[PDB]
Scaffold this active site. Structure first.
Site, PDB file in Angstrom:
ATOM      1  N   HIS A  25     -22.314 -16.682 -38.491  1.00  0.00           N
ATOM      2  CA  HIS A  25     -23.682 -16.385 -38.056  1.00  0.00           C
ATOM      3  C   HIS A  25     -24.741 -17.438 -38.326  1.00  0.00           C
ATOM      4  O   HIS A  25     -25.901 -17.226 -37.971  1.00  0.00           O
ATOM      5  CB  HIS A  25     -24.153 -15.029 -38.586  1.00  0.00           C
ATOM      6  CG  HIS A  25     -23.410 -13.872 -38.006  1.00  0.00           C
ATOM      7  ND1 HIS A  25     -23.582 -13.468 -36.702  1.00  0.00           N
ATOM      8  CD2 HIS A  25     -22.494 -13.035 -38.543  1.00  0.00           C
ATOM      9  CE1 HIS A  25     -22.790 -12.440 -36.456  1.00  0.00           C
ATOM     10  NE2 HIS A  25     -22.123 -12.153 -37.558  1.00  0.00           N
TER      11      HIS A  25
ATOM     12  N   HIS B  46     -23.272  -9.425 -44.150  1.00  0.00           N
ATOM     13  CA  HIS B  46     -23.033  -8.968 -42.772  1.00  0.00           C
ATOM     14  C   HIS B  46     -24.273  -9.188 -41.939  1.00  0.00           C
ATOM     15  O   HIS B  46     -25.389  -9.052 -42.443  1.00  0.00           O
ATOM     16  CB  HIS B  46     -22.672  -7.486 -42.714  1.00  0.00           C
ATOM     17  CG  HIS B  46     -21.287  -7.186 -43.181  1.00  0.00           C
ATOM     18  ND1 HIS B  46     -20.173  -7.495 -42.434  1.00  0.00           N
ATOM     19  CD2 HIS B  46     -20.834  -6.617 -44.321  1.00  0.00           C
ATOM     20  CE1 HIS B  46     -19.089  -7.131 -43.097  1.00  0.00           C
ATOM     21  NE2 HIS B  46     -19.464  -6.591 -44.242  1.00  0.00           N
TER      22      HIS B  46
END
Length: 104
Positions: free
Chosen positions: A10, A97
């Site tokens: 990410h 996350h």
């Protein structure tokens, strides 16, 4: 799952994510979307400072985002760049996350 993997999945060092290239690799397994944060890692890690138990946190600042969105042809993507807040799961002072864009 952890900060090391969060970075790989990410965080991008280029805004021009090579979607058709990177999305086909094992890490992304030709999935239909992935949001990348265009930032060096420390300011992203800082989002989670002080937060011990797992908790979702929406950024107060906006960040540069690069999305790889699938087209009607499997595995050709369109890169879309935008600026927005994002939500991460913080655990033991680090993002572990990516939850979503704009809201938890």
């Amino acid at each position: 799952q952890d900060w090391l993997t969060f970075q790989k999945k990410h965080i991008t060092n280029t805004r021009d994510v090579d979607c058709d290239n990177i999305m086909s690799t094992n890490l992304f397994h030709a999935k239909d979307k992935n949001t990348f944060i265009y930032s060096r890692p420390e300011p992203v890690k800082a989002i989670c400072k002080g937060i011990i138990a797992s908790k979702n946190v929406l950024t107060t600042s906006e960040f540069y985002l690069s999305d790889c969105n699938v087209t009607s042809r499997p595995a050709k993507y369109k890169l879309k760049k935008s600026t927005n807040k994002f939500c991460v799961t913080c655990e033991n002072q680090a993002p572990v996350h990516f939850v979503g864009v704009g809201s938890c």
